[PDB]
Design an enzyme around this catalytic site. Structure first.
Site, PDB file in Angstrom:
ATOM      1  N   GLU A  77       0.818  -1.200   0.000  1.00  0.00           N
ATOM      2  CA  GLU A  77       0.000   0.000   0.000  1.00  0.00           C
ATOM      3  C   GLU A  77       0.861   1.264   0.000  1.00  0.00           C
ATOM      4  O   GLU A  77       2.091   1.193   0.072  1.00  0.00           O
ATOM      5  CB  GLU A  77      -0.932  -0.014   1.203  1.00  0.00           C
ATOM      6  CG  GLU A  77      -2.060  -1.017   1.059  1.00  0.00           C
ATOM      7  CD  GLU A  77      -3.321  -0.562   1.756  1.00  0.00           C
ATOM      8  OE1 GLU A  77      -4.416  -0.712   1.178  1.00  0.00           O
ATOM      9  OE2 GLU A  77      -3.209  -0.036   2.883  1.00  0.00           O
TER      10      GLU A  77
ATOM     11  N   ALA B  20      -0.110   5.911   0.010  1.00  0.00           N
ATOM     12  CA  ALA B  20      -0.759   7.047   0.666  1.00  0.00           C
ATOM     13  C   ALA B  20      -2.210   6.758   1.074  1.00  0.00           C
ATOM     14  O   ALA B  20      -2.490   6.531   2.254  1.00  0.00           O
ATOM     15  CB  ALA B  20      -0.691   8.285  -0.229  1.00  0.00           C
TER      16      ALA B  20
ATOM     17  N   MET C 223      -4.370   1.277  -2.151  1.00  0.00           N
ATOM     18  CA  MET C 223      -3.566   0.129  -2.513  1.00  0.00           C
ATOM     19  C   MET C 223      -2.771   0.392  -3.788  1.00  0.00           C
ATOM     20  O   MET C 223      -3.169   1.187  -4.635  1.00  0.00           O
ATOM     21  CB  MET C 223      -4.502  -1.072  -2.671  1.00  0.00           C
ATOM     22  CG  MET C 223      -4.000  -2.237  -3.499  1.00  0.00           C
ATOM     23  SD  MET C 223      -5.321  -3.460  -3.696  1.00  0.00           S
ATOM     24  CE  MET C 223      -5.628  -3.912  -1.987  1.00  0.00           C
ATOM     25  N   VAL C 224      -1.648  -0.296  -3.929  1.00  0.00           N
ATOM     26  CA  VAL C 224      -0.853  -0.190  -5.124  1.00  0.00           C
ATOM     27  C   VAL C 224      -0.673  -1.564  -5.753  1.00  0.00           C
ATOM     28  O   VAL C 224      -0.368  -2.527  -5.043  1.00  0.00           O
ATOM     29  CB  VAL C 224       0.524   0.430  -4.784  1.00  0.00           C
ATOM     30  CG1 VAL C 224       1.328   0.672  -6.046  1.00  0.00           C
ATOM     31  CG2 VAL C 224       0.343   1.723  -3.994  1.00  0.00           C
TER      32      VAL C 224
ATOM     33  N   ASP D 176      10.004  17.392   0.447  1.00  0.00           N
ATOM     34  CA  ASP D 176      10.002  16.098   1.194  1.00  0.00           C
ATOM     35  C   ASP D 176      10.957  15.113   0.521  1.00  0.00           C
ATOM     36  O   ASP D 176      10.661  13.942   0.298  1.00  0.00           O
ATOM     37  CB  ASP D 176       8.612  15.528   1.363  1.00  0.00           C
ATOM     38  CG  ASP D 176       8.540  14.497   2.475  1.00  0.00           C
ATOM     39  OD1 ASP D 176       9.406  14.490   3.354  1.00  0.00           O
ATOM     40  OD2 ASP D 176       7.572  13.712   2.432  1.00  0.00           O
TER      41      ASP D 176
END
Length: 346
Positions: free
Chosen positions: A23, A25, A28-29, A139
């Site tokens: 996963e 941000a 799910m990826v 970031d």
């Protein structure tokens, strides 16, 4: 609607053969087979519309990534969503599949000097483009540097990115900050909102140090500890550098600390290339005004095998003005997200 470890992961007639890649941000990826280009791709399912913070990071990122086109910056290949705002509950962002990232790589692999030099080159090459667009990433860290098997590097995660705003960078001592602690420049703790390009150069210096030793250089556990880590290596700031801090509370805090001498880079990094350390010194300069800028870094002798300003492109269309997203509700951000993603509809 196809499912994966459910949950719904429905990416239409174009993308098939799913495989769950953890996963990220706001969802799910997975990797997927892209049937138009006949490659595997990465697809991030994003469900941000319940929280305005997630909506802002999502919109920011989409607007920036769609405008940017650069080899060392992740692209958005496609965006999948419902055909109406009413039906849009999720957005799927399709990007090149990259095997790993620098955070994962440093957990187990020692980098040769040649690898350090080439990775640093590509970080700075991409950063030159970002900065040329008047944008700050804000970031930068190893996990936001994607890598393939042939060592190509691409910067990702522009969820905290902002248009540069040096005239409005000043703030009081101990102002809260959101981006990742270990890569925060010392001025963030002292007097800075992180609205100048120098914030990103500090982060790159942290990343270089991390490549040299496979450990973070300034692993603070909290806010002032982060500053104490920095001061522990750089030593106490000079009177000149203190004079540049007009914030009385910040200045007096620094004056309250016992004197610390500089730890020499070659004692910290005894196996490092001398030119790497000279560049590192210039990136991890306490005073942000004296800190090296991206183009100077590119031109530093450590990078002379790669430096070619004609092959280090800049943005055609910089973001001239502040986006004004901070002050927008969830529902309005969703409408802008719909408009921004219309380009990918059949």
């Amino acid at each position: 609607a196809a499912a994966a470890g459910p949950q719904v992961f429905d990416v239409g007639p174009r993308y098939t053969n799913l495989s769950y890649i953890g996963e990220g941000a706001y969802g799910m990826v997975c990797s997927a087979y892209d049937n138009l280009n006949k490659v595997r791709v990465a697809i991030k399912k994003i469900s941000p519309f319940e929280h305005q913070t997630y909506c802002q990071s999502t919109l920011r990122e989409i607007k920036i990534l769609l405008r940017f086109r650069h080899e060392n910056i992740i692209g958005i290949n496609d965006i999948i969503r419902a055909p109406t705002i009413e039906q849009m509950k999720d957005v799927y962002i399709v990007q090149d599949l990259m095997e790993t990232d620098l955070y994962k790589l440093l957990k187990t692999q020692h980098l040769s000097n040649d690898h350090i030099c080439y990775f640093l080159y590509q970080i700075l090459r991409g950063l030159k483009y970002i900065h040329s667009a008047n944008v700050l990433h804000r970031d930068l860290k190893p996990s936001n540097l994607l890598l393939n098997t042939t060592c190509d590097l691409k910067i990702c995660d522009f969820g905290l990115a902002r248009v540069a705003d040096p005239d409005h960078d000043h703030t009081g001592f101990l102002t809260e900050y959101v981006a990742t602690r270990w890569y925060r420049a010392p001025e963030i703790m002292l007097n800075s909102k992180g609205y100048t390009k120098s914030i990103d150069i500090w982060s790159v210096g942290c990343i270089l140090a991390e490549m040299l030793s496979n450990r973070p250089i300034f692993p603070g556990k909290h806010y002032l500890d982060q500053l104490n880590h920095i001061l522990g290596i750089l030593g106490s700031p000079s009177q000149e550098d203190l004079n540049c801090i007009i914030n009385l509370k910040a200045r007096n805090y620094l004056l309250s600390l016992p004197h610390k001498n500089k730890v020499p880079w070659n004692r910290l990094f005894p196996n490092a290339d001398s030119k790497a350390l000279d560049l590192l010194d210039k990136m991890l300069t306490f005073n942000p005004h004296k800190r090296i800028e991206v183009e100077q870094a590119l031109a530093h002798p450590y990078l002379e095998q790669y430096y070619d300003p004609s092959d280090e492109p800049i943005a055609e269309a910089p973001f001239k003005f502040d986006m004004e997203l901070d002050d927008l509700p969830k529902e309005k951000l969703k409408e802008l997200i719909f408009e921004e993603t219309a380009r990918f509809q059949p």
